Amino acid sequence: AQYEDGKQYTTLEKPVAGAPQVLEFFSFFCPHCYQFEEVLHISDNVKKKLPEGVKMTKYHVNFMGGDLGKDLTQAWAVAMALGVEDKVTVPLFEGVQKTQTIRSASDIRDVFINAGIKGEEYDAAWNSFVVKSLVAQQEKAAADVQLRGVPAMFVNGKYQLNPQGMDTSNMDVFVQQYADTVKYLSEKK
Fold this sequence. Notes:
Elements: E1 9-11, E2 22-26, H1 31-39, H2 42-49, E3 56-60, H3 66-82, H4 85-97, H5 105-114, H6 119-126, H7 129-144, E4 152-155, E5 159-161, H8 171-186
Parallel strand pairs: 2-3
Antiparallel strand pairs: 1-5, 2-4, 4-5
Helix pairs in contact: 1-4, 2-8, 3-7
PDB class: oxidoreductase
Keywords: Oxidoreductase, Oxidoreductase inhibitor
Assembly: monomeric
C-alpha cells in the first residue's frame, strides 16, 4: 500500500470517540514545533487540502517548560477564547525560542498587549471560567491519546501522523506529503 499502517501513520490501539477531526498538539518550547509553524506552516497547508469547513483544532501541552509551559497552555486558552491565535502565535514562538524574552506570565501578557489585545480584556479572559474550561479540554485531549511528544497530529481520534521517515530534503514536497496524508486519513471509512 502507498500509505501503510505503522509507517506514515499509526492506528491508535485505544481510539478516542468524539475527538476532533484534525487535532494537533504543540508547545511553544518545542523546537520542531517552531519549524512546523513558522517555516513549514503545516497547519495552514493541511487546512488548504481538507474540505472547506472541517474542524481543525490545535492545543498546547504542559509537559515542556515547567511552570511557564503551563502558563502558556492557559495563554493559548485565552488566544482560543478571544480568537486571536493568528496574532499571537508568531510572537509567542519567537519570545520563547528566538529572543527568549518570555520568562514570566507577565511577559506572555505583554505579547498579547503588543498584539492589540487590551489589558482589561486579556486579564478578564485569563481569569474566566470559559478559559478554565478550555484549559481542561486541552489537558483531556492530551490524556485521551496518552500524549508523550510534540509536534503531534491525530485524525478522527483514530490515526496518528508519522512524519519521521518522510523525505525532508525539500520542505515544500514534505509539507505536501504531510497534508496529502492527513487528507487520506480523513477520508478513511
